[PDB]
Scaffold this active site. Sequence first.
Site, PDB file in Angstrom:
ATOM      1  CE  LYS B 210      -4.044   2.223   2.363  1.00  0.00           C
ATOM      2  NZ  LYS B 210      -4.892   1.977   3.194  1.00  0.00           N
ATOM      3  CG  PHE B 212       6.073   0.585  -3.386  1.00  0.00           C
ATOM      4  CD1 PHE B 212       5.043  -0.265  -3.876  1.00  0.00           C
ATOM      5  CD2 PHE B 212       7.196   1.033  -3.750  1.00  0.00           C
ATOM      6  CE1 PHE B 212       5.515  -1.345  -4.663  1.00  0.00           C
ATOM      7  CE2 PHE B 212       7.736  -0.087  -4.944  1.00  0.00           C
ATOM      8  CZ  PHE B 212       6.923  -1.100  -5.342  1.00  0.00           C
ATOM      9  CB  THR B 213       7.587   3.144   2.734  1.00  0.00           C
ATOM     10  OG1 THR B 213       6.542   2.862   3.887  1.00  0.00           O
ATOM     11  CG2 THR B 213       7.474   4.010   1.900  1.00  0.00           C
ATOM     12  CB  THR B 214       6.179  -2.799   3.865  1.00  0.00           C
ATOM     13  OG1 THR B 214       4.624  -1.964   3.784  1.00  0.00           O
ATOM     14  CG2 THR B 214       6.273  -3.748   4.958  1.00  0.00           C
ATOM     15  CD  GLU B 216       8.519  -6.783   7.193  1.00  0.00           C
ATOM     16  OE1 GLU B 216       8.406  -5.811   7.095  1.00  0.00           O
ATOM     17  OE2 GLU B 216       8.230  -7.600   8.341  1.00  0.00           O
ATOM     18  N   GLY B 271      -5.455  -2.526   4.073  1.00  0.00           N
ATOM     19  CA  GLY B 271      -4.745  -3.412   3.482  1.00  0.00           C
ATOM     20  C   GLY B 271      -5.496  -4.966   3.791  1.00  0.00           C
ATOM     21  NE  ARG B 272      -7.917  -4.532   9.778  1.00  0.00           N
ATOM     22  CZ  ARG B 272      -7.192  -3.425   9.996  1.00  0.00           C
ATOM     23  NH1 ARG B 272      -5.987  -3.183   9.723  1.00  0.00           N
ATOM     24  NH2 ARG B 272      -7.739  -2.396  10.538  1.00  0.00           N
ATOM     25  CD  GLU B 357      -3.284  -5.232  10.831  1.00  0.00           C
ATOM     26  OE1 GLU B 357      -3.761  -5.334   9.619  1.00  0.00           O
ATOM     27  OE2 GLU B 357      -2.009  -5.330  11.017  1.00  0.00           O
ATOM     28  CG  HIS B 388      -7.211 -37.319  13.241  1.00  0.00           C
ATOM     29  ND1 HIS B 388      -7.509 -38.705  13.575  1.00  0.00           N
ATOM     30  CD2 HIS B 388      -8.430 -37.137  12.092  1.00  0.00           C
ATOM     31  CE1 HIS B 388      -8.561 -39.085  12.791  1.00  0.00           C
ATOM     32  NE2 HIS B 388      -9.039 -38.130  11.917  1.00  0.00           N
ATOM     33  CE  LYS B 518       5.080  -1.206  10.623  1.00  0.00           C
ATOM     34  NZ  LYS B 518       4.146  -0.565   9.542  1.00  0.00           N
TER      35      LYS B 518
END
Lengths: 556, 555
Positions: B210, B212-214, B216, B271-272, B357, B388, B518
């Site tokens: 979103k 474009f700075t994250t 990872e 984002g979510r 979130e 199980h 962060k």
Amino acid sequence: AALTRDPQFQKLQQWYREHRSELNLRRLFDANKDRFNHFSLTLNTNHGHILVDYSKNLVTEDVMRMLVDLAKSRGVEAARERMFNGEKINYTEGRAVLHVALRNRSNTPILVDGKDVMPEVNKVLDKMKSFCQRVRSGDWKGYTGKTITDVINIGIGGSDLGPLMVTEALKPYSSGGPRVWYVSNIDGTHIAKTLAQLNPESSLFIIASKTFTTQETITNAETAKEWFLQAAKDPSAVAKHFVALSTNTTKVKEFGIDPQNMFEFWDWVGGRYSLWSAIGLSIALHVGFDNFEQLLSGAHWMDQHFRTTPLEKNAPVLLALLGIWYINCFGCETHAMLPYDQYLHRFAAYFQQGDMESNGKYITKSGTRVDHQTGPIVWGEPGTNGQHAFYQLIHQGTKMIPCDFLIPVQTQHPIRKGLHHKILLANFLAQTEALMRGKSTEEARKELQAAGKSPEDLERLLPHKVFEGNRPTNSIVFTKLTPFMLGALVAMYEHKIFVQGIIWDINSFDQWGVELGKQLAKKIEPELDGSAQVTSHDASTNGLINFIKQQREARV
Amino acid sequence: AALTRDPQFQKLQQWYREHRSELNLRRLFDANKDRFNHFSLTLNTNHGHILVDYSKNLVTEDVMRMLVDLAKSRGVEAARERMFNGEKINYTEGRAVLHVALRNRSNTPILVDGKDVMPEVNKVLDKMKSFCQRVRSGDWKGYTGKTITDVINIGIGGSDLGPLMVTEALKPYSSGGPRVWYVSNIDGTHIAKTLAQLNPESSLFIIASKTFTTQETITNAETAKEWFLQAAKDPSAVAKHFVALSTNTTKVKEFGIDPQNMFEFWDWVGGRYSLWSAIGLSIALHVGFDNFEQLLSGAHWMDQHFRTTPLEKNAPVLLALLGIWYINCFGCETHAMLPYDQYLHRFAAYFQQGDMESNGKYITKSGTRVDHQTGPIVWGEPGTNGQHAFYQLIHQGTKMIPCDFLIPVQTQHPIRKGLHHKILLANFLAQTEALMRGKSTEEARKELQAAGKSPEDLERLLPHKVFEGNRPTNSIVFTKLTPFMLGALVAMYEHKIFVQGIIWDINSFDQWGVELGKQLAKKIEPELDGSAQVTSHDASTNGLINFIKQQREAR
Ligand SMILES: C/C(=C/C(=O)O)C(=O)O
Ligand SMILES: C/C(=C/C(=O)O)C(=O)O
């Protein structure tokens, strides 16, 4: 129940009620610069170090003393010896509990019914080693003379989750091994989409089931054998492409498996403790038997740590006791496991069974109903992904969630001169620091003013930017995620679970809770045939069935 | 807090304290053979039916009326209209909340700052359609002239979980599409083991973020680009192999991607809540744009159901209120989501973000701290596997755990003349029946007698075989898991989450709780370089760092 009547537990509960609001991690660390040294253990396995840092927990030296006293009062050490010595501590079923024998590399005798079990343990291991050398080298050929390229484990629960978790975790060690596939759900898309990608001439099927009666697995197995025989036709070729991992030789024989193709284990191997047995064949085929032996050896090391270490410095014991603190005093329902390792992406799911099927119990050894909490709900996703999914709730929700953060120091993929792993480690460290420290109104305000917020944007945003912190974590750091180290880590949690069950006075090694659902499904299966309405159940089950029958014919 | 002061809420709590013990499912069903009809909803979407059976819950008619009265008192309907009309209901960020606009197939104007957003929504959708046509047909060629065989989505969180969950769920609809790969973790394993299976000449990278700075995602994207340029050598070849899904044109261009290669969305797309936007481009590439439009159409259908249905029969409202009952009266910490569908194996993980979130919050609209529980911990695994692994604890542990059981009536793989799906359906039905009915001491004593147990053995084992039951569930059954139906189901839960947040008076649409981690990671990163000891943090952070530095050389 036993635990509630225990004097050391009552001392614990009383201390908690009096001193609860005194446990603030910021003030604990500000006041004792030696807190890390006193509330952590550094283990040298000689094949990697393990740092268990439990210092960001809501505990003091007095609290740890009281917890260790609880372990002694509840007889943890004596129960441990009973397990290792082969006594029938699975008392509801009258069975020993001897996953430790499966990895007993020292071959010290372990007697069950007056008979040493290790020769039989080592006979099967030898058979696994031989079989893996032949498959992996190409000496074992399919019905048209081709080497095996694909190994398909058909099994569910304990016959699935362990081998799946381990082969995912040790994927870098699989060079030269066949591809491994895991089919477990009865849901036909699972076997269907697997078989669509395989060549019958070079596919080896492993049918894994302790009793060899589990409907999901036997049905999947018959579907795979029909698919195979449609291609091969010759029934003698089944002996080249189907093996079984089981305790039930008869049912394996009646299914049509060559008795020489049976890899045996025993009734004292619990399904959720079975990856160390023949159930691990898919691991050994994928990464080689030498690596499988390393995996056993890591568990064996941790078995000896648990057995020989004084309780106050004993890693699984301390982990178990911190859980008891949060479960039975703080009342936390859950326990998050957050490995900062993509290869460990099925680790949390593995201990969902390992933990919750062991200690999701409510009847004590004396037959008495517990009057306290038992096992927690285990969950988690690998970091850093979880940070962008659900950590919001861990930081700023209304739930207390004890978390175990795990990470290897050394990565299997040091790309870009270690930049990726450096960022991964930075986040691993920052998140537990954030959960502990939080951020006060005063600190949040100073940030907003420095950012340039107007007095009205500041006052509206300010309270939403405060982190109350004081959220406890364990940090478990280890040199590298090798086969040996994975074995030690899994064993560490196995013994954590054992200790908690002994303290709760429950049976960690039975699972009577799965029977009712199996009975009821047996009665509904035939009722789904035909279009007649069903009236034989409660209104809801009837209504759902009849809706299923109405829509079974609809053309979307 | 608003909720605690609400007269209807206080009425709910009083009733709970007084009549809790009347809530036994075996007795309730025995006393009302019309219970299923009374406490279930059937939804005809024209592309499949949805049965929402909430009759195995610890509710009576009086409880449901009190719960619906709570939704009225807390203003659910007025809040809904604010969302759909483009008002800035994300009040901490001053943003609208308009994922419903992304799938507004009717193209009814939706105004933000007096300007209709649908022309831009449909402009991006048209760009997505044309691009998918060109890539999927082979008309879009790589830098050596080959067609694209692999699409790699690089993104995390909201830019990863939705697209991954949908392409996993809709895998049968992907014939003729390229393989899709999802790289999200910064952990170098994730990109490394993906790139090792790919050829730069036929791989298309989608850089999804979103802002474009994250860190990872931008780090992964630079690693992919370096790997790509080692083969192509020519920077101009990047325009054929890298596209961006983002709101930040400036940072996309600085990364070196053509503006013409950017698929935009807008700040009112959380984002979510973003798989319906350009973020969904990997879905459309894999299953085709037509199937993506059906996904949007199903969400649009559920949107209309939520808007026009009286609260008492409104699926997401009823699911929300049931959760409020278990969270705020019974005190249940968690909510288990259990799809009896292997294709839905990432569904629970998706709503971990979507739910936790959104509603993992503790500050109300008025800036006051909540004095009640908010969002639950969401978890689960597909059935029957979970039977199980952890159902032991659901049946015989010490936790109360509301569970949503989900299943399609028709399978995508009707092998063995439907045998596998028959067994799956039987387990789906049997497990909620078992959770509800349990098994009494007398019932278990009879089984042990018939099994031939000695009186001593029988008495020892008997209490271990008892199931206390009275464990509530929802059963959600739908005709078939098509793209349309998936969209309707995901939208249902989105609106469930919306309703709960309004009742709690929290902001479901911000996420300020991610900032601290962060900040602290930015401070630690440069301290990890070198072998010098760190002593500037708390003693644990320091000790961990110094152990990392020590063990970084070990062989
Ligand atoms: C889940 C399971 C149970 C058992 O056979 O004991 C199996 O291994 O098939
Ligand atoms: C998780 C995330 C946040 C953002 O960019 O706003 C992303 O999409 O990269």
